[PDB]
Design brief:
Blueprint (H helix, E strand, L loop, with lengths): L1 H15 L3 H13 L1 H15 L5 H7 L2 H18 L5 H19 L3 H4 L3 H17 L7 H8 L4 H14 L6 H28 L3 H13 L14 H7 L8 H12 L8 H17 L6 H6 L3 H27 L3 H15 L5 H21 L11 H20 L9 E2 L5 E2 L7 H19 L1 H17 L5 H14 L5 H21 L2 H17 L2 H4 L3 H14 L7 H15 L1 H5 L9 H12 L5 H15 L6 H19 L2 H11 L4 H4 L3 H9 L2 H7 L3 H8 L4 H9 L1
Antiparallel strand pairs: 1-2
Helix pairs in contact: 2-3, 4-5, 5-8, 6-8, 8-10, 10-12, 11-12, 12-14, 13-15, 14-17, 17-18, 17-19, 18-20, 19-21, 20-21, 20-22, 20-23, 21-22, 22-24, 23-25, 24-25, 25-28, 27-28, 28-31, 31-33
């Protein structure tokens, strides 16, 4: 272990007194030694703490210490850039530029795989970041001018511009940025304009199209629609399999521009993109299956296809509709999008759904009323034969609601599970909105679409838990789209067939799914349940019966469904109806003991809050007070001869808590001397509060704080 002391004393002296070979051995030693790793790493941070000047001359005199020396420079730059004088740091910057030009101009850099090039570019980035605004106004023109000499220099500068586009908030300030840098932007376009037409080098063109893609939004419109740029991207760079995915992004970015003086060129863009896409991809080709076997590169084309069609059509569909000739091409392109919409993935679905939402929204705002059950809306007439495909598509693809909790595993196992954030939920809400619009377009077709698949489900044909889940989720999202007289006639058939489906299905695996679907599909229709009493009775009784279920997740969901029903239908529970002589709440209060036994305590609390909300709706003078008495008689009786549930019912029932609060009021103060916040906050009688409940405070409460 004597050599360890020699190697330790060797490195400490050379730094404060530089030799290349001794520096080389150390960085290799740390990588190939266990102790050497830790000791030299500590030695590296100790050497880095000193200063920079040894670094640059170390570079001048290699790859491992290049990464090392670049770490030294990059780190010391961010620290002392504000401290050092502007001229000296600019001198370091000139050294960086010269190093970049030199190393990028060497053919062996390509054989070096350009790792040193990438890191050296990062250093330029870190410098340019803080320097650019107040130091270099000509950096743009300098790079453009230096890119006109060689290939490697140019393409590397395209990477630089790409990185500059990464390190470069507000609408107005960005528009001022465009108007101020438009002069410097024209040159950046002209460079790419030159390369794309004159160059034979694919690696150069790829980075060129990448940079032109990123700088496209800021570049003035005069260099875009007034030139052959659109036709160039159409005929030349669209066909080539090398640039198929990167050029599609550019055309997408082109389509995002708001029309002002240019109208025809956009139609030409659409016609030519479709002319070339129909040749690139066949209409008969299934997109989903080609995406499944699609390579990493093959998928980006499809995603960019959906991204493009959505981007363009959202702005210029009106311009395409206007001409009678473009109507056919629009139908074909819409067909294309409809095909792409069938790809099973997280991203692409939301991308094309972003279009379907907008589509449904516009013609809904045109004609809110459904047709039918002439004067056909002009906007509807065009999209008419492609509308029913969207409804048929939207119903089957809808995701899980935030309300219900039932999850299927890949092996076919059913279980309750909660998922992260709002990504899966926000999607569901969006599909819900879109389907609502489309349902408003025609409720008849929507009715038939759902009735047909329900009949196939009752028959059992193609019956899987997921297949019924998607449908019932759809029906739950339709809530409020159809008129009362039509909604009743339609929903009663759905409920009846759903109950019969629950009867046919055997086992807990099926029963859990059917209960889940039947609970969510019920909770979303309170306006139907308040119309029919006996119907609501059968439903709520089914809830209470499903709270007897042993399978986890079902009963917890049944409690939430009960709350969801109790909230809106609160007025229908207390009153004695025409069909039944005894109030439903009265029946519940004597039957609760057998129901709440299987439930978790946390679920029981929610159940009590539901009952408290039901009984709080009734007035009827002293009648509701007697019902509150009967409701809380069981837990409260043993108190005279826990409080959390009491204050829960206090906030649930509301102000008329005086009948139960009064009897236990005095004892609270008497024991406390040895709940009010909730009642007072909910009380509507300040006159009674101040003159009765307020005086017994001073002695028991105010003096207590002193004592």
């Amino acid at each position: 272990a004597i050599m360890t002391m020699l190697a330790d004393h060797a490195a400490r002296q050379l730094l404060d007194f530089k030799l290349d070979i001794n520096l080389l051995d150390n960085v290799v030693n740390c990588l190939y030694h266990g102790e050497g790793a830790q000791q030299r790493m500590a030695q590296e941070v100790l050497t880095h703490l000193k200063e920079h000047p040894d670094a640059w001359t170390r570079v001048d005199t290699n790859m491992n210490t290049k990464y090392y020396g670049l770490q030294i420079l990059e780190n010391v730059i961010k620290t002392r850039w504000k401290i050092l004088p502007r001229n000296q740091c600019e001198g370091i910057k000139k050294y960086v530029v010269g190093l970049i030009i030199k190393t990028s101009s060497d053919p062996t850099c390509v054989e070096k795989e350009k790792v040193y090039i990438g890191k050296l570019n990062m250093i330029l980035v870190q410098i340019l970041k803080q320097e650019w605004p107040k130091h270099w106004p000509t950096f743009i023109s300098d790079i453009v001018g230096a890119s006109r000499t060689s290939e490697s220099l140019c393409q590397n500068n395209m990477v630089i511009l790409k990185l500059l586009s990464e390190e470069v908030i507000t609408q107005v300030k960005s528009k001022h940025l465009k108007d101020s840098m438009c002069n410097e932007f024209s040159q950046i376009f002209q460079l790419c304009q030159f390369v794309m037409e004159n160059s034979q080098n694919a690696p150069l063109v790829h980075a060129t199209l990448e940079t032109l893609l990123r700088f496209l939004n800021w570049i003035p419109l005069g260099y875009i629609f007034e030139t052959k740029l659109i036709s160039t991207l159409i005929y030349k760079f669209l066909n080539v399999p090398m640039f198929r995915n990167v050029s599609l992004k550019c055309l997408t970015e082109i389509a995002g521009v708001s029309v002002s003086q240019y109208e025809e060129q956009f139609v030409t863009l659409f016609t030519l993109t479709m002319m070339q896409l129909k040749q690139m991809l066949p209409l008969n080709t299934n997109i989903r299956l080609a995406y499944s076997n699609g390579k990493d590169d093959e998928q980006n084309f499809i995603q960019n296809l959906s991204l493009f069609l959505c981007t363009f059509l959202k702005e210029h569909d009106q311009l395409i509709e206007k001409r009678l000739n473009l109507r056919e091409t629009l139908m074909e392109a819409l067909h294309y999008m409809l095909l792409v919409s069938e790809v099973e993935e997280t991203e692409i679905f939301k991308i094309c759904l972003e279009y379907w939402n907008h589509l449904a929204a516009e013609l809904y705002r045109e004609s809110p009323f459904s047709t039918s059950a002439f004067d056909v809306p002009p906007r509807r007439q065009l999209y008419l034969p492609m509308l029913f495909k969207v409804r048929l598509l939207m119903v089957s693809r809808m995701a899980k609601p935030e309300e219900v909790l039932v999850v299927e595993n890949d092996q076919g196992e059913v279980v309750r599970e909660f998922m992260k954030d709002t990504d899966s939920i926000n999607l569901y809400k969006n599909m819900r909105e879109t389907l609502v619009y489309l349902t408003h377009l025609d409720y008849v077709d929507t009715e038939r679409i759902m009735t047909e698949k329900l009949h196939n489900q009752v028959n059992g044909t193609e019956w899987s838990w997921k297949n019924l889940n998607t449908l019932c989720w759809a029906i739950g999202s339709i809530s409020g789209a159809m008129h009362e007289e039509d909604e009743k006639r339609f929903l009663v058939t759905v409920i009846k067939d759903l109950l019969g489906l629950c009867e046919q299905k055997r086992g807990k695996d099926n029963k859990a799914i059917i209960a889940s679907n039947i609970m969510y599909i019920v909770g979303q229709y309170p306006r139907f349940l308040r119309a029919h009493w006996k119907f609501l009775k059968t439903v709520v009784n089914k809830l209470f019966e499903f709270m007897h279920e042993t399978h986890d997740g079902v009963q917890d969901m049944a409690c939430d469904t009960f709350i969801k029903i109790a909230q809106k239908c609160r007025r229908h529970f207390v009153q004695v109806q025409v069909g039944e002589v005894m109030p439903f709440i009265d029946e519940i209060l004597n039957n609760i003991n057998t129901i709440i036994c299987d439930l978790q305590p946390q679920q029981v609390h929610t159940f009590y809050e539901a009952v408290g909300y039901m009984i709080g709706a009734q007035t009827d003078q002293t009648v509701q007070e007697h019902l509150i008495e009967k409701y809380m008689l069981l837990p409260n009786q043993v108190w005279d001869s826990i409080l959390k549930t009491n204050v829960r019912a206090c906030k649930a029932v509301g102000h008329p808590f005086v009948i139960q609060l009064g009897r236990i009021y005095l004892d609270m103060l008497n024991v406390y001397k040895c709940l009010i916040s909730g009642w007072v906050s909910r009380s509507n009688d300040p006159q009674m509060v101040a003159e009765n409940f307020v005086p017994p405070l001073l002695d028991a409460v105010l003096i207590d704080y002193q004592r």
